[PDB]
Amino acid sequence: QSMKIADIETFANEFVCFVKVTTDSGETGWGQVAPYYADITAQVLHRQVAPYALGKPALDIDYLVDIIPEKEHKFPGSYLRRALGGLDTALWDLRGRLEGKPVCELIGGTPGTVRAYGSSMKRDITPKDEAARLSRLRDRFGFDAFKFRIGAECGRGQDEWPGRTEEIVPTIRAAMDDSVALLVDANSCYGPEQAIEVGKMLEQNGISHYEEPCPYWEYEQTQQVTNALSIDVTGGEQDCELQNWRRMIEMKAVDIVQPDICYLGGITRTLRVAEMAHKAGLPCTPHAANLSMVTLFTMHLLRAIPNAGKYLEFSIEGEDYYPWQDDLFVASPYEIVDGKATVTDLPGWGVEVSPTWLETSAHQISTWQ
């Protein structure tokens, strides 16, 4: 008898939901679904994911991740994939713990360090404040790459306020030495013509990464931008469907692919996207926008994949922006030294969810009958 999945448990609040899997012999692993409306994701997982997993071989993640999107074929898109990513990440943890190895080792890497870029999420902050803040971060933690925001999120061509973009790009560049890589993200702001003009201005100021210039669901628009520019154009964080990834990569719509491990549905599906990209010659620089487990999943992936991109996205926002990210874990795995994060040799994900966070969570369980 191979180990079977006996119980699937969730521990949630509106923001974050952890997933705990237990086998019929008592071994466990912990994962997490995508943050945001996590309490709803939890319900989807019990209702639409768990019925297909209970009683199944616990080590056969490929079966589950392959079959459940077809069992629930009337539900294409985000919520199902978010729920599946919780089960997948918990199962990889379970395996790591069984084998006594970190997830990066199971998927072909080794523990060690990863270059991080400090990622700013605010469009609210003035250019001068953002330059100040990033400079202080560079001094304190040693970051040698940063990402800041331009345009307005799905802004249909409009900036956050008049002139913010023209100001911020050279203000940050001025504050930072040429040894510091600068990245920007437009959050689907521009049509292609405008996106190209903005991109030529980025190229005048030593910016090296241009993320989501156009509505992300319009591949042709993005492809027009990639083709017209020299700056690397990057995208993919909201793309949760493998057939969509195959199409984006066939079209070479971007220079760099940026799946989000939780939005895409877990490590297994992310590894398939990274391989598709590797076959086409494209680096994979995953999206990780907060300090829930999404960052640590990404750290393990970047230690492993042959076409890992240049750095880990590492959110530098504090408690005003992500108050729900504080005290998720017994010990933070996110200490940065000399601009680098570290994957340790601890088994599985190598973290423990805070008992203080768990006491107050909404718990739900599905058990194999």
Q: State the residues that interact with a second copy by CB under 8 A.
A: 36-37, 40, 43-44, 47-48, 70-71, 73-81, 153-154, 188, 216-218, 238, 240-241, 243, 263
Judge contact between 333 and 354, C-beta under 8 A: no
d(CA 361, CA 305): 34
SS (H, E, C) 265-310: CCHHHHHHHHHHHHHHCCCECCCCCCCCHHHHHHHHHHHHCCCECC
Considering beta carbons, is residue 8 or 189 the nearer one to Mg ion?
189
Binding partner at 73 among Mg ion, a second copy, none, C-beta below 5 to 8 Å by kind: a second copy
Residue 71 binds what, of Mg ion, a second copy, none (CB under 5 to 8 Å, by partner type)? a second copy
Between vectors from CA 37 to CA 11 and to CA 285, what angle results, nearest 5°?
Answer: 95
CB of 228 to a second copy, least distance (A): 21
Bin 142: left if φ > 0, else alpha if -120 < ψ < 50, else beta: left
Please enumerate in sequence order all residues whose Cβ is within 8 A of that of 82, keeping only pairs 6 or more positions apart, or say none: 33, 34, 41, 44, 262, 263, 265
Q: Find which of Mg ion, a second copy, none residue 217 binds, CB within 5 to 8 Å per kind.
A: a second copy
Q: Judged by CB, which is closer to Mg ion: 159, or 185? A: 185
What does the block give as tokens for 228? 């017209």
Nearer to Mg ion, 93 or 185 (CB): 185
48 binds, among a second copy, Mg ion, none (CB under 5 to 8 A by kind): a second copy
Which residues make up each annotated binding site for Mg(2+)?
A: 185, 211, 237
- Residues 6 or more apart whose CB falls under 8 angstroms from that of 362 comprise 10, 11, 12, 13, 39, 42
> In terms of CB distance, is 37 or 141 closer to a second copy?
37
Pick one of Mg ion, a second copy, none as the site partner of residue 185 (Cβ within 5 to 8 A by kind).
Mg ion
Closest separation between CB of residue 124 and a second copy, Å?
Answer: 18
- For the CB of residue 4, give the shortest distance to a second copy in the complex, in Å: 24
CA-closest candidate to residue 361, choices 20, 34, 28, 90? 20
Question: Does residue number 185 form part of the binding site for Mg ion (CB under 5 A)?
Answer: yes
Q: Min. distance of Cβ 242 from a second copy in angstroms?
A: 9
Shortest spacing between CB 173 and a second copy, in angstroms: 29
Q: Report in angstroms how near the CB of residue 276 gets to Mg ion at its nearest.
A: 20
Residue 357 contact, options a second copy, Mg ion, none, Cβ 5-8 Å cut-off depending on partner type:
none
C-beta atoms surrounding 215 within 10 Å: 16
Q: Which region holds residue 152: left if phi is over 0, alpha if psi is between -120 and 50, else beta?
A: beta
- Interaction site with Mg ion (CB under 5 A): 185
